[PDB]
Amino acid sequence: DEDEILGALTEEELRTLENELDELDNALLPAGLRQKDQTTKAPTGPFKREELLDHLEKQAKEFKDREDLVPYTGEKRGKVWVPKQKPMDPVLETVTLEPELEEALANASDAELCDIAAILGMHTLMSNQQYYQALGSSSIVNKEGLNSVIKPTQYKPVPDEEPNATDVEETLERIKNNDPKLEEVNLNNIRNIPIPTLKAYAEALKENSYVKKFSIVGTRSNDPVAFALAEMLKVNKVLKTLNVESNFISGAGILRLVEALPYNTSLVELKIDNQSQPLGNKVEMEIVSMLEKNATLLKFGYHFTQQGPRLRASNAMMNNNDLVRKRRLADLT
Amino acid sequence: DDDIAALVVDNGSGMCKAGFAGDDAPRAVFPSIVGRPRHQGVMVGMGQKDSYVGDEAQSKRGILTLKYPIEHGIVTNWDDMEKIWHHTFYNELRVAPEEHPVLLTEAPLNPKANREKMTQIMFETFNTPAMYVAIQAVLSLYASGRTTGIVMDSGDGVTHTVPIYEGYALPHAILRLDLAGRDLTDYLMKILTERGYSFTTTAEREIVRDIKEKLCYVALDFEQEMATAASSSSLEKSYELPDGQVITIGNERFRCPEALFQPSFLGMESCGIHETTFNSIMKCDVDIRKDLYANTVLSGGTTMYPGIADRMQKEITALAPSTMKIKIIAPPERKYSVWIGGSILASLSTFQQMWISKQEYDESGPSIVHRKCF
Amino acid sequence: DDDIAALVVDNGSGMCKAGFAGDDAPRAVFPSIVGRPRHQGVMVGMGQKDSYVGDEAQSKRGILTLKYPIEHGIVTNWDDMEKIWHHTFYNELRVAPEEHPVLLTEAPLNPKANREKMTQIMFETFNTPAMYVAIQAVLSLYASGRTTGIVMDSGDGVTHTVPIYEGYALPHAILRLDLAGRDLTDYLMKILTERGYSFTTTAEREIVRDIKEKLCYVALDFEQEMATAASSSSLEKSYELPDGQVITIGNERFRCPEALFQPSFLGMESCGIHETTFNSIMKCDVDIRKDLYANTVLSGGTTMYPGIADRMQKEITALAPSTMKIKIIAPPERKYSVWIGGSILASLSTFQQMWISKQEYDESGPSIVHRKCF
Amino acid sequence: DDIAALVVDNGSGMCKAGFAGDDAPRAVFPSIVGRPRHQGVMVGMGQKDSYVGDEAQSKRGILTLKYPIEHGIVTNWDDMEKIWHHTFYNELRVAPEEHPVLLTEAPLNPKANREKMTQIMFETFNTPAMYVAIQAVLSLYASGRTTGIVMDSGDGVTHTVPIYEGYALPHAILRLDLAGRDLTDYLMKILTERGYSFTTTAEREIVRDIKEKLCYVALDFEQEMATAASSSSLEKSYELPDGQVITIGNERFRCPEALFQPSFLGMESCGIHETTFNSIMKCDVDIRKDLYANTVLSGGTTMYPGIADRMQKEITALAPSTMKIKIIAPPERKYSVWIGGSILASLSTFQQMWISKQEYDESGPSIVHRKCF
Amino acid sequence: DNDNSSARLFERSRIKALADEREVVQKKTFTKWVNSHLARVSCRITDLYKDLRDGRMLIKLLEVLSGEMLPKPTKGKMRIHCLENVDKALQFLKEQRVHLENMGSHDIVDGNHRLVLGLIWTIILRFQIQ
Amino acid sequence: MAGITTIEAVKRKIQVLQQQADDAEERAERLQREVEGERRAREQAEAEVA
Amino acid sequence: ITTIEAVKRKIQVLQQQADDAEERAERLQREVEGERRAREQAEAEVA
Ligand SMILES: Nc1ncnc2c1ncn2[C@@H]1O[C@H](COP(=O)(O)OP(=O)(O)O)[C@@H](O)[C@H]1O
Ligand SMILES: Nc1ncnc2c1ncn2[C@@H]1O[C@H](COP(=O)(O)OP(=O)(O)O)[C@@H](O)[C@H]1O
Ligand SMILES: Nc1ncnc2c1ncn2[C@@H]1O[C@H](COP(=O)(O)OP(=O)(O)O)[C@@H](O)[C@H]1O
């Protein structure tokens, strides 16, 4: 009875259903615009919080009290389970092997007791490391005891490393000046480097012929920095190693980086490990397929989730290193 | 004719629903909150019958402290459970628990004491004749009408993804991520405090939750959304407070749900929900992966963000192989669908074998739930 | 040139063990874990360094994400292997690898590119004059001291069984099963969830591995031990977390290694280690089986659980005919046996003919490893 | 006219069934029985305990798959009863009580196997008559020539028999246990070399499909190895059921080469060409000349592209120069063991060959040795 | 690969045609039989594969053939109720000594021609009109 | 059993251990006497049958 | 040099003596079975 079911619904609901079926949500509108606004009143005031608190308090005070039909008393109205008890095993036998050996083990401490407990085969009673050092040698080594609680390994403390002392503006100024005595630029783990500043570094290294290695590890770099570096790599002929590990570069940015590899023959090591999100297998397929195009790159640090692209990338690295070996051999003879 | 069937009680982390089996909609919907007088003994012990429950608790937000008895899907306080359950049985449903079987839901990988304690409360306090415990994700797959697919369920305490192929569950591929809407509420407060609106207590918690429900959306592109929000103010909206003051959210509308996809904002070392679904699919066999790609089902109240489905489809298609197709089923009624699953599952004629009757409980105790259920 | 002593390096999935040839024990034992910065914030303790290698990474778990370069005996990350090898050569043995030969180990059934890439990396980045690649389970039999028997090795990445009769290995009877300590650790996390405790991150993985190495044992009879553990709390033991709280594992201490004997707990349809060893014996000829029953040799760090020897003997005695005599040889130093036999192998006078020269590599490329090694 | 008998071919890999006098079988399905692995949480679903035939192959992920026949010997008989029930009642929709049944057997096998089949088919299915025939005799029937040597190769057993003018030589019958399943396992073990991992029973079907699509027999082995090592023009790409793409390459022709060199599997037996030559050489001097020109291939395993040229070249190398070698490989040889059977039940004198119900009732299940060859 | 092509060629043609013609005439006969037996009640089957999918037709056919009462079919439009309706008829067949192989409720629900034809043939052969 | 002592259980195990060692000793002497008797009987039978 | 180390040494020596004792016993048992197996047929042949 479709007509009766529709008549059971409200007529205003029927008109709303017709309007909603005509609207079908808002798929055409973007994600932000598809929501309706709450009220039409303009924003006013610097949000005085105490007025909110006082209004809420008096609103709570002048409220009519709902009275519940049945009060709660915590009454248990069902049968208690009362778990069963067992008669268990009431056995008692004395072994009494030797008056000598009675008194020998009667006054032994628990730490030395656990050695003879473990040598007889109660492996369940104590920990495994304790159990094995008990069986290690013919002497009492066990200090802890079977009853005592086990504790984790502490390993060894590591001394604190000095924080990064490489300043930003002077380094960029020296890079822009083509300084002959600046070869390594380190930017690892520096607080709050501006994105336009990193881009300024990216165009600054375009014309620098004296810096051989670069690193922006842990700089919270993003896709525009990746795009600018990808643009820079085509021009530059001196940079040996680029390190962009531990960043927020998306898959498309990494694709832009690998797409610059055929144009330049000066980069030998590139590391893109530990990114915030996985790149996806399509990006991996593109990376490996057109990294097979390049013949200069030797070291590439990336953990491939799939097996096919990983195998092909390993083969490509093997081929590049074997080309180096072959040209050395041909140069010798 | 079995005493108008059983009762379906979907006790979610932040809000509880209850109703009769065989009905499409739950009869009672109310938050799972216990409100107590805060610190004072003023006005002749004002705040009498100190436990305020449900709608009456949120009515007196100013003069009370609101406590959630369920945190992360685990019962911290059991007296508050049995108070809430008494309120459901007597104050709203107005039916006796002695003649009606009860169906209950729980998270997949929960500590084992919860099932035994729920069985003890059902059989010792409300003396129900029969009871069963199920999983919300299986109920969601029941509500979707399909017998093959992967189910995400994200409530206020827990997110879990399970795969099911042809009615056979794969226990090794079930995942549990502890990133839910409460964390999004806290992150929304954190980013609102930077703008200038500081929200601290439980009344502020309810207000911020209402703001999040009414004004949030999942951006398709995060950096494009940042550029748009910095360039112009068209994305900005206005929210009025109960007293009358009006504030502007603006940049905070899409940053709140983005922590679902990037947990680095929340301060958690975890992967996104899309990575959880993809890893749950990779943990299955080779052949049944394709169907799990074509039957992704969303559920829970958290998935009512606008544009979550298209964004997560884009992410999955970024991860998945390009040969096969990806589709996402996002019913508009999914927030209640878990309960609807119970309304299906208690309605089946073959389920009458699966009830845990009182006679077996009186011989086995609360441990029988480990053998009878799942 | 008797002063030139070769270096014996075993690259296990969990730990790397390096030492000088002709010694009874390895000089350096350290886990192969690479730690990298988290994304929640900047670290406190390191500046220009990009990553931490070895026990330095293990100590600073709270600010690092830990990655294993070896996955199931396969080198997924070759740069991570270069970092591990550099740390081994320069920070633990404190010797220049240019002046010493290097001996390495390998799992039996591997991708063929593993040996080639290993040889190329060693020769190009370390300039060693000679090197060699050997297979682990032959070195185990060298360490045991006999030339006839079956070796069942179980490391941190893979399990493999191989028979040897009078020094002739049978390649058609070698079996490789993917069951090691990492899957046991993951199952231990999954079975520690229902007691209440939760472990998610990689530091939690190391904590769970430390719990497993000290608390787990193999039950002789599974049903009898299950009934005993349900009967009373005699088997329960306590552990101290680094935070300060004390946990009590109880029942699941002997449930973790039971996956080695029933893989269906992990969802895989493979057989246990006892069935694998029996199948490997049945693949050989009829005549030599009588020797192979008498000389079963255990190895690997995974077989360090107490009670494994009697259980394996009982299972094989159930499988094998009644006439035959079975004994299991479990050396007390077996955890380092793969290294120890290597120290034997570099000491033999014939083995000096078997090295791979720098010149031979120079003409023949990295493909010389297939012709020169087994 | 009389009722047409049912021709049922029980192979190690596939089971075929049809009516006598037809030119093709009417039902072909794999001889696989699968059972559920995981647990079922959905209530109200199907409660079937065993998947059989194509239905088991339809759902591989949640099943452990088993073969009731291995190496030409039945190991599980309940699964065989399920196979035959699904063949009769579902695939053909016939009543077995009114149809004679013809069955197919390898030449050398355990004797009791025969009795069991007879003891099943007269008891559970109540057939009025039944008969058992050797595979290679039916293959020679379907070849159309009375004189020849038949080499057959399936998933369980390889066998060569010589027949001269309808007379068989029992002492020259040769059997070898290298067959298709061994090639599948060797392909798995050799695909491990490239890093690809296949372990479960469901993945063995994937490996079998890869072998059927992308394997061929090289005419010269060392030259092919040199060619495959020098260039990458021999590689092919396959798509996994989950969208992964793999590359076989050098493993395409190394797997079938194991048929000619059994030392790859550790077996010390000789190749198939050596087995055929030895079976010819065991015969009398006079009948060898007709046997050299009438070699017949049969079975699915002989469907590798290039097997005929390699077999002819090797046999010509072994044979004396003045004799000429002809390898007869019909294009539909995969069903030859069926087709000749469909011929054999249509003959006039074969109505005098049937093992009747009364004869079995009189002389028990051991009657099959007196009637069947 | 001309011989492999010819083998696939023969496989694609002769086996498929010889099975298809038998299947067509068998289903045409079975439709007539089930329509003659279902005509006593106000029911008719116009398609063998589609009308037996839902399950009411099968349970009514077992009702009229057995002459003996069957439990209430569950009411509902989803797949699960359909699985229930097929499963109850399968259980009723399981009681009265009829032996079935490769029969699941989801096989009839999904619509496999071989299994529904085999089920109808088994009903004709082994079940008793009585 | 809730009430137990480690010393007592260890002591019972020592008892069982010495019982095992003693049993194996009667086993050895048992079987040595048996094999000598059987060898002598076989030799005598062989001589007289020859 | 005390009594407890002597206890550990004593029980360890006893244990390995016991193990060697069952090894020798079972080997001797199988040899005994073979000898009796041979002798009985000789008696039957005498008859
Ligand atoms: N209209 C809405 N838009 C966006 N989010 C919503 C909406 N309604 C509810 N939510 C979110 O859903 C959550 C409630 O989930 P709920 O279904 O109660 O979880 P449970 O499974 O524990 O019942 C709230 O925290 C809120 O953030
Ligand atoms: N005392 C112990 N008891 C039980 N298991 C252990 C113990 N020590 C190490 N293990 C297990 O052995 C593994 C290390 O094995 P290892 O010898 O490194 O394997 P590999 O052969 O790869 O070197 C660890 O992951 C741990 O799970
Ligand atoms: N087109 C093909 N090319 C190569 N090998 C094939 C082909 N088709 C089938 N095979 C092999 O033949 C086997 C099937 O043989 P089959 O005729 O079913 O044996 P039987 O029926 O005697 O058991 C399969 O295992 C497969 O390995």
From Swiss-Prot, chain D:
Lineage top rank: taxon: Eukaryota
Residues that bear Tele-methylhistidine: H71
Pfam entry (one): Actin
Enzyme Commission (EC) number: 3.6.4.-
Post-translational modification: ISGylated. Oxidation of Met-42 and Met-45 by MICALs (MICAL1, MICAL2 or MICAL3) to form methionine sulfoxide promotes actin filament depolymerization. MICAL1 and MICAL2 produce the (R)-S-oxide form. The (R)-S-oxide form is reverted by MSRB1 and MSRB2, which promote actin repolymerization.
Transmembrane segments: none
Chief location category: cytoplasm
Biological processes per GO annotation: adherens junction assembly; apical protein localization; axonogenesis; cell motility; cellular response to cytochalasin B; establishment or maintenance of cell polarity; morphogenesis of a polarized epithelium; positive regulation of double-strand break repair via homologous recombination
Subcellular location: Cytoplasm, Cytoskeleton; Nucleus
Keywords: Acetylation, ATP-binding, Cytoplasm, Cytoskeleton, Hydrolase, Methylation, Nucleotide-binding, Nucleus, Oxidation, Ubl conjugation
GO cellular component: actin cytoskeleton; actin filament; adherens junction; apical junction complex; axon; brush border; calyx of Held; cortical cytoskeleton
InterPro entries from the UniProt entry: Actin, Actin/actin-like_CS, Actin_CS, ATPase_NBD
Gene Ontology MF: a single term: ATP binding
Residue list for modification N6-methyllysine: K82
Reaction catalysis annotation: ATP + H2O = ADP + phosphate + H(+)
Modified residues (Methionine (R)-sulfoxide): M42, M45
Function in brief: Actin is a highly conserved protein that polymerizes to produce filaments that form cross-linked networks in the cytoplasm of cells. Actin exists in both monomeric (G-actin) and polymeric (F-actin) forms, both forms playing key functions, such as cell motility and contraction. In addition to their role in the cytoplasmic cytoskeleton, G- and F-actin also localize in the nucleus, and regulate gene transcription and motility and repair of damaged DNA.
Other comment: In vertebrates 3 main groups of actin isoforms, alpha, beta and gamma have been identified. The alpha actins are found in muscle tissues and are a major constituent of the contractile apparatus. The beta and gamma actins coexist in most cell types as components of the cytoskeleton and as mediators of internal cell motility.
Family: Belongs to the actin family.
SUBUNIT field: Polymerization of globular actin (G-actin) leads to a structural filament (F-actin) in the form of a two-stranded helix. Each actin can bind to 4 others. Identified in a IGF2BP1-dependent mRNP granule complex containing untranslated mRNAs. Component of the BAF complex, which includes at least actin (ACTB), ARID1A, ARID1B/BAF250, SMARCA2, SMARCA4/BRG1, ACTL6A/BAF53, ACTL6B/BAF53B, SMARCE1/BAF57 SMARCC1/BAF155, SMARCC2/BAF170, SMARCB1/SNF5/INI1, and one or more of SMARCD1/BAF60A, SMARCD2/BAF60B, or SMARCD3/BAF60C. In muscle cells, the BAF complex also contains DPF3.
Name this protein carries in UniProt: Actin, cytoplasmic 1
